Amino acid sequence: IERPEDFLKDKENAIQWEKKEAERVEKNLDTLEKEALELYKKDSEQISNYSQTRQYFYDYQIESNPREKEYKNLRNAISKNKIDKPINVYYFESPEKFAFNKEIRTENQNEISLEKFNELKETIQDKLFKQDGFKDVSLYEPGNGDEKPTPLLIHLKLPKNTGMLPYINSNDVKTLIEQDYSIKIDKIVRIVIEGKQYIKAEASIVNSLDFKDDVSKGDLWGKENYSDWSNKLTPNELADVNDYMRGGYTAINNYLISNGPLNNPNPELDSKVNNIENALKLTPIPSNLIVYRRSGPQEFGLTLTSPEYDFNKIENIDAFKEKWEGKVITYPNFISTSIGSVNMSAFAKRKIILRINIPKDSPGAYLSAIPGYAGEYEVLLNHGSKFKINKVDSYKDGTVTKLILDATLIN
Amino acid sequence: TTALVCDNGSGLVKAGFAGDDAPRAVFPSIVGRPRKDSYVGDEAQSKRGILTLKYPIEHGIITNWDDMEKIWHHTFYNELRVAPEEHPTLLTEAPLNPKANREKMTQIMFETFNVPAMYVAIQAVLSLYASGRTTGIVLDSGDGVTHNVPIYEGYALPHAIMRLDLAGRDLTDYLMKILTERGYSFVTTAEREIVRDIKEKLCYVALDFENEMATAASSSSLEKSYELPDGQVITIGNERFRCPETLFQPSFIGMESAGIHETTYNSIMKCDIDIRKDLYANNVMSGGTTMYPGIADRMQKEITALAPSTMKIKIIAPPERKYSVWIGGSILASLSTFQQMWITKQEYDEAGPSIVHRKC
Ligand SMILES: Nc1ncnc2c1ncn2[C@@H]1O[C@H](COP(=O)(O)OP(=O)(O)OP(=O)(O)O)[C@@H](O)[C@H]1O
Ligand SMILES: C/C1=C/C(=O)O[C@@H]2C[C@@H](CC[C@H](C)/C=C/C=C/CC1)O[C@@](O)([C@@H]1CSC(=O)N1)C2
Ligand SMILES: [Ca+2]
């Protein structure tokens, strides 16, 4: 009479409990939401693709996208029902999704070799991968006669209070979530179903504040946490940060990028970097936080003019992926970032978006707490930060293919 | 009884008397980085080193307060030959100038220069005002920064202001680079001044860039020639429109921001839909860098291409465009209904630097 946290293989009890839940939750949807759902079932693939990619445009392009009304209303439908205890869910991924850019086995082979398994473990095991968008999940491990489109099965623990919409699609019970978080894969085991080998990955949610296009909500949080930060500095620190902010950034960052501190030491500058840095530890980032930086090519050893930078050609994505996926880039300069994901005039044309996950307690500040600052909803991160590039995604902005880099700050 | 108007630009100071049609002094907004001690403005067109050229305003914002004081000092004593104590003073500021910053200005004006009264106006609002307007969108493009500033009923809409750190100074550097690419060598700071002149003298904005490239390649019709101080005369070809093409394609210069047509559009689009028609009809250009022949026509074409096809689009490029900020200040400082707007020594003594926010 209570559902377990994990229906495991018990398909019959899964359906039975979920059909009941579907009839209950369905009662609580308003008109907008039922409509959104009826819309989703007829167009799930296009609607999900939009929910992955929507924040990356200019606000005015967001506000007027015809797909946007359906996104907001489907979003609201999912979050009407919030689980009272954790539930495990099951779904197939393509291995591309975790930057394993090669088949695990073919669609015809039944065994997954000792090598591939092991290679797969090195690729996916030690990272937080960002998930985003509407996803269909199942409440039981599939068995005989359920679709099994990949060698990769995800077994994910959704925490208490995760939004989950169970619903009848004519004959079946289906389960809809909006992924709004990151995943860690704690283990991978092999498993057999209907004669073939599969990989089951045990995954858990790591949560992060991500305001995406909601720059206002993002600002509230920034000012709520950072408007007393200015008063926490020493006289010296205040002045050296005011200097950075008001225009000193180009000389400090230029000095760092050539590794002046070692190659040609400048003691005024060094002291300035020392103070800014110390200042960035006065209010450590109080919560796990996703930030967005739109990047120049120079940041990835490239120029506006490099033919490797035309991402309209798969080769170049594939080559950028080789160079960077799985790698870690170090930033010698102070890195300025925004809690907003939107496109902005100052960088309209930039083609690489570094989407960064900042662990709670990392050095950083919401510089934009200080009025008049030209940076937009800006968080500044410390010089010498390293970023693990777990995954490279791509999207169309007009005719221009740009890149999203799932990254993690590792100190 | 006669107000001073002083327009503080990234590269040029425009200064003079309210009620006049043109400023009386315009001079370089530079001082000195020493080894008698430091020469200020057009006088540092002398020892520019090893007592070297420093710029106290960068990208429209004051950042070196000490050299700023010296600029102001020079303005009053060396240039305008007046006593600051004797004249209410209107100063201009960049769009989105921080409060902190507006207050430092006030404090210094009152305490260091002992002005009887003062006011700070937004530079773009005054340009609009110079051409009889109170609603409109201004492209202000100077030496160190360019802005798109939508304004409704005398109010700038700070959330829709676009800022590009791309302007005349970068355009001269780029003319230097490309002229060097042709086999000349323009690299020193002295040479930087000659290319400024070449830029102001011979550059223009092609109505159709790719077409102008084709004309220049296949015939000779577009070449002009120029005499250097040493009497050498050089030829200049497609550099003539390539240079200010950077304003539309910042990528010419490695920059990845939107161009001035796109920031214009963006700016308009961040404004609420009932006022947009008003903005499209009332696109005002101002600043030395909007002086290129062809630019108004080119802007007309680009904005037409982005806007809905039922939109009335008017570009206003006054011939006085390069002093229109100053002029707007002259008109304001004489406007009679403007006189209650001044901040007196008395009100400053009472309310402090903060009074400078009145609501206009
Ligand atoms: N005819 C012209 N053609 C092109 N550029 C010009 C012309 N006349 C002046 N300029 C450029 O205008 C710039 C100065 O204009 P302006 O005084 O409007 O700028 P500013 O107020 O000093 O600086 P800013 O507005 O960036 O703070 C210089 O780069 C100058 O080369
Ligand atoms: C009539 C006039 C115009 C002018 O030069 O505007 C300004 C003034 C100038 C100050 C420094 C140099 C030495 C010039 C001193 C005297 C200049 C003559 C003043 O800095 C600019 O040259 C910069 C550099 S090159 C450019 O494109 N912007 C723009
Ligand atoms: Ca100016």
mmCIF file with all atom_site columns, N, CA, C and O in Angstrom, chain A residues 321-344:
data_model
loop_
_atom_site.group_PDB
_atom_site.id
_atom_site.type_symbol
_atom_site.label_atom_id
_atom_site.label_alt_id
_atom_site.label_comp_id
_atom_site.label_asym_id
_atom_site.label_entity_id
_atom_site.label_seq_id
_atom_site.pdbx_PDB_ins_code
_atom_site.Cartn_x
_atom_site.Cartn_y
_atom_site.Cartn_z
_atom_site.occupancy
_atom_site.B_iso_or_equiv
_atom_site.pdbx_formal_charge
_atom_site.auth_seq_id
_atom_site.auth_comp_id
_atom_site.auth_asym_id
_atom_site.auth_atom_id
_atom_site.pdbx_PDB_model_num
ATOM 1  N N  . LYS A 1 321 ? 36.176 18.488 -30.122 1.00 0.00 ? 321 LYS A N  1
ATOM 2  C CA . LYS A 1 321 ? 35.836 17.423 -29.169 1.00 0.00 ? 321 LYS A CA 1
ATOM 3  C C  . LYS A 1 321 ? 37.065 16.597 -28.743 1.00 0.00 ? 321 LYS A C  1
ATOM 4  O O  . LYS A 1 321 ? 37.364 16.480 -27.539 1.00 0.00 ? 321 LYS A O  1
ATOM 5  N N  . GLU A 1 322 ? 37.789 16.084 -29.737 1.00 0.00 ? 322 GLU A N  1
ATOM 6  C CA . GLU A 1 322 ? 39.094 15.424 -29.536 1.00 0.00 ? 322 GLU A CA 1
ATOM 7  C C  . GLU A 1 322 ? 40.045 16.216 -28.644 1.00 0.00 ? 322 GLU A C  1
ATOM 8  O O  . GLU A 1 322 ? 40.504 15.709 -27.625 1.00 0.00 ? 322 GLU A O  1
ATOM 9  N N  . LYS A 1 323 ? 40.346 17.448 -29.052 1.00 0.00 ? 323 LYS A N  1
ATOM 10 C CA . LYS A 1 323 ? 41.202 18.345 -28.284 1.00 0.00 ? 323 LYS A CA 1
ATOM 11 C C  . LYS A 1 323 ? 40.704 18.545 -26.846 1.00 0.00 ? 323 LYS A C  1
ATOM 12 O O  . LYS A 1 323 ? 41.521 18.536 -25.929 1.00 0.00 ? 323 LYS A O  1
ATOM 13 N N  . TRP A 1 324 ? 39.388 18.701 -26.636 1.00 0.00 ? 324 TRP A N  1
ATOM 14 C CA . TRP A 1 324 ? 38.880 19.179 -25.328 1.00 0.00 ? 324 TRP A CA 1
ATOM 15 C C  . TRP A 1 324 ? 38.036 18.272 -24.390 1.00 0.00 ? 324 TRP A C  1
ATOM 16 O O  . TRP A 1 324 ? 38.237 18.280 -23.162 1.00 0.00 ? 324 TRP A O  1
ATOM 17 N N  . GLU A 1 325 ? 37.094 17.499 -24.946 1.00 0.00 ? 325 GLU A N  1
ATOM 18 C CA . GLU A 1 325 ? 36.260 16.583 -24.152 1.00 0.00 ? 325 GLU A CA 1
ATOM 19 C C  . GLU A 1 325 ? 37.088 15.653 -23.285 1.00 0.00 ? 325 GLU A C  1
ATOM 20 O O  . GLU A 1 325 ? 37.931 14.891 -23.775 1.00 0.00 ? 325 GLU A O  1
ATOM 21 N N  . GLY A 1 326 ? 36.837 15.706 -21.986 1.00 0.00 ? 326 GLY A N  1
ATOM 22 C CA . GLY A 1 326 ? 37.582 14.897 -21.041 1.00 0.00 ? 326 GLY A CA 1
ATOM 23 C C  . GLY A 1 326 ? 38.771 15.671 -20.514 1.00 0.00 ? 326 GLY A C  1
ATOM 24 O O  . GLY A 1 326 ? 39.236 15.404 -19.404 1.00 0.00 ? 326 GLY A O  1
ATOM 25 N N  . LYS A 1 327 ? 39.249 16.649 -21.284 1.00 0.00 ? 327 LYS A N  1
ATOM 26 C CA . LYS A 1 327 ? 40.395 17.461 -20.861 1.00 0.00 ? 327 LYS A CA 1
ATOM 27 C C  . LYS A 1 327 ? 40.079 18.468 -19.760 1.00 0.00 ? 327 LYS A C  1
ATOM 28 O O  . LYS A 1 327 ? 38.910 18.665 -19.419 1.00 0.00 ? 327 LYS A O  1
ATOM 29 N N  . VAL A 1 328 ? 41.113 19.070 -19.169 1.00 0.00 ? 328 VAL A N  1
ATOM 30 C CA . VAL A 1 328 ? 40.902 20.225 -18.281 1.00 0.00 ? 328 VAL A CA 1
ATOM 31 C C  . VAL A 1 328 ? 41.696 21.478 -18.676 1.00 0.00 ? 328 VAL A C  1
ATOM 32 O O  . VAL A 1 328 ? 42.931 21.454 -18.620 1.00 0.00 ? 328 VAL A O  1
ATOM 33 N N  . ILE A 1 329 ? 40.983 22.551 -19.072 1.00 0.00 ? 329 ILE A N  1
ATOM 34 C CA . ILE A 1 329 ? 41.580 23.878 -19.381 1.00 0.00 ? 329 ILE A CA 1
ATOM 35 C C  . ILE A 1 329 ? 41.847 24.723 -18.133 1.00 0.00 ? 329 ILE A C  1
ATOM 36 O O  . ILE A 1 329 ? 40.981 24.843 -17.271 1.00 0.00 ? 329 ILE A O  1
ATOM 37 N N  . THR A 1 330 ? 43.044 25.311 -18.024 1.00 0.00 ? 330 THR A N  1
ATOM 38 C CA . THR A 1 330 ? 43.338 26.201 -16.865 1.00 0.00 ? 330 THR A CA 1
ATOM 39 C C  . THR A 1 330 ? 43.275 27.608 -17.353 1.00 0.00 ? 330 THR A C  1
ATOM 40 O O  . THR A 1 330 ? 43.717 27.885 -18.438 1.00 0.00 ? 330 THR A O  1
ATOM 41 N N  . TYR A 1 331 ? 42.704 28.479 -16.551 1.00 0.00 ? 331 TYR A N  1
ATOM 42 C CA . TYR A 1 331 ? 42.576 29.872 -16.880 1.00 0.00 ? 331 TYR A CA 1
ATOM 43 C C  . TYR A 1 331 ? 43.594 30.634 -16.062 1.00 0.00 ? 331 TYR A C  1
ATOM 44 O O  . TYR A 1 331 ? 43.536 30.650 -14.806 1.00 0.00 ? 331 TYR A O  1
ATOM 45 N N  . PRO A 1 332 ? 44.565 31.257 -16.755 1.00 0.00 ? 332 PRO A N  1
ATOM 46 C CA . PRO A 1 332 ? 45.557 31.989 -15.946 1.00 0.00 ? 332 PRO A CA 1
ATOM 47 C C  . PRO A 1 332 ? 44.957 33.315 -15.397 1.00 0.00 ? 332 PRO A C  1
ATOM 48 O O  . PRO A 1 332 ? 45.298 33.760 -14.268 1.00 0.00 ? 332 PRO A O  1
ATOM 49 N N  . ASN A 1 333 ? 44.057 33.922 -16.176 1.00 0.00 ? 333 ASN A N  1
ATOM 50 C CA . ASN A 1 333 ? 43.474 35.210 -15.809 1.00 0.00 ? 333 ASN A CA 1
ATOM 51 C C  . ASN A 1 333 ? 42.303 35.033 -14.862 1.00 0.00 ? 333 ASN A C  1
ATOM 52 O O  . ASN A 1 333 ? 41.823 33.911 -14.658 1.00 0.00 ? 333 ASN A O  1
ATOM 53 N N  . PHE A 1 334 ? 41.839 36.126 -14.280 1.00 0.00 ? 334 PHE A N  1
ATOM 54 C CA . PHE A 1 334 ? 40.548 36.107 -13.658 1.00 0.00 ? 334 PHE A CA 1
ATOM 55 C C  . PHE A 1 334 ? 39.475 35.845 -14.744 1.00 0.00 ? 334 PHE A C  1
ATOM 56 O O  . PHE A 1 334 ? 39.560 36.389 -15.890 1.00 0.00 ? 334 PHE A O  1
ATOM 57 N N  . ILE A 1 335 ? 38.519 34.958 -14.434 1.00 0.00 ? 335 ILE A N  1
ATOM 58 C CA . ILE A 1 335 ? 37.485 34.604 -15.398 1.00 0.00 ? 335 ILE A CA 1
ATOM 59 C C  . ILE A 1 335 ? 36.204 35.260 -15.025 1.00 0.00 ? 335 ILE A C  1
ATOM 60 O O  . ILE A 1 335 ? 35.659 34.961 -13.975 1.00 0.00 ? 335 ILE A O  1
ATOM 61 N N  . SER A 1 336 ? 35.695 36.145 -15.867 1.00 0.00 ? 336 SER A N  1
ATOM 62 C CA . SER A 1 336 ? 34.381 36.697 -15.551 1.00 0.00 ? 336 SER A CA 1
ATOM 63 C C  . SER A 1 336 ? 33.204 35.994 -16.279 1.00 0.00 ? 336 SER A C  1
ATOM 64 O O  . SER A 1 336 ? 33.313 35.556 -17.440 1.00 0.00 ? 336 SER A O  1
ATOM 65 N N  . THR A 1 337 ? 32.129 35.784 -15.528 1.00 0.00 ? 337 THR A N  1
ATOM 66 C CA . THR A 1 337 ? 31.042 34.873 -15.950 1.00 0.00 ? 337 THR A CA 1
ATOM 67 C C  . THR A 1 337 ? 29.705 35.537 -15.597 1.00 0.00 ? 337 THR A C  1
ATOM 68 O O  . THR A 1 337 ? 29.679 36.568 -14.910 1.00 0.00 ? 337 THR A O  1
ATOM 69 N N  . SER A 1 338 ? 28.598 34.943 -16.017 1.00 0.00 ? 338 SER A N  1
ATOM 70 C CA . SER A 1 338 ? 27.309 35.528 -15.676 1.00 0.00 ? 338 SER A CA 1
ATOM 71 C C  . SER A 1 338 ? 26.396 34.422 -15.220 1.00 0.00 ? 338 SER A C  1
ATOM 72 O O  . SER A 1 338 ? 26.558 33.262 -15.654 1.00 0.00 ? 338 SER A O  1
ATOM 73 N N  . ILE A 1 339 ? 25.433 34.765 -14.360 1.00 0.00 ? 339 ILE A N  1
ATOM 74 C CA . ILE A 1 339 ? 24.433 33.769 -13.957 1.00 0.00 ? 339 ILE A CA 1
ATOM 75 C C  . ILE A 1 339 ? 23.356 33.662 -14.996 1.00 0.00 ? 339 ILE A C  1
ATOM 76 O O  . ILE A 1 339 ? 22.579 32.711 -14.956 1.00 0.00 ? 339 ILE A O  1
ATOM 77 N N  . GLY A 1 340 ? 23.332 34.607 -15.929 1.00 0.00 ? 340 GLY A N  1
ATOM 78 C CA . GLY A 1 340 ? 22.418 34.532 -17.046 1.00 0.00 ? 340 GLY A CA 1
ATOM 79 C C  . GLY A 1 340 ? 22.995 33.721 -18.188 1.00 0.00 ? 340 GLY A C  1
ATOM 80 O O  . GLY A 1 340 ? 24.213 33.675 -18.372 1.00 0.00 ? 340 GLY A O  1
ATOM 81 N N  . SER A 1 341 ? 22.146 33.074 -18.971 1.00 0.00 ? 341 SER A N  1
ATOM 82 C CA . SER A 1 341 ? 22.635 32.225 -20.052 1.00 0.00 ? 341 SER A CA 1
ATOM 83 C C  . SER A 1 341 ? 22.382 32.923 -21.385 1.00 0.00 ? 341 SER A C  1
ATOM 84 O O  . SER A 1 341 ? 22.753 32.428 -22.448 1.00 0.00 ? 341 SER A O  1
ATOM 85 N N  . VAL A 1 342 ? 21.727 34.078 -21.330 1.00 0.00 ? 342 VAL A N  1
ATOM 86 C CA . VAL A 1 342 ? 21.236 34.716 -22.550 1.00 0.00 ? 342 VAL A CA 1
ATOM 87 C C  . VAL A 1 342 ? 22.348 35.211 -23.452 1.00 0.00 ? 342 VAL A C  1
ATOM 88 O O  . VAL A 1 342 ? 23.499 35.358 -23.019 1.00 0.00 ? 342 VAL A O  1
ATOM 89 N N  . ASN A 1 343 ? 22.005 35.432 -24.717 1.00 0.00 ? 343 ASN A N  1
ATOM 90 C CA . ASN A 1 343 ? 22.921 36.122 -25.593 1.00 0.00 ? 343 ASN A CA 1
ATOM 91 C C  . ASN A 1 343 ? 22.833 37.631 -25.314 1.00 0.00 ? 343 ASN A C  1
ATOM 92 O O  . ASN A 1 343 ? 21.774 38.120 -24.907 1.00 0.00 ? 343 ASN A O  1
ATOM 93 N N  . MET A 1 344 ? 23.948 38.353 -25.487 1.00 0.00 ? 344 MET A N  1
ATOM 94 C CA . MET A 1 344 ? 24.010 39.823 -25.247 1.00 0.00 ? 344 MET A CA 1
ATOM 95 C C  . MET A 1 344 ? 24.834 40.514 -26.303 1.00 0.00 ? 344 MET A C  1
ATOM 96 O O  . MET A 1 344 ? 25.812 39.941 -26.786 1.00 0.00 ? 344 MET A O  1
#
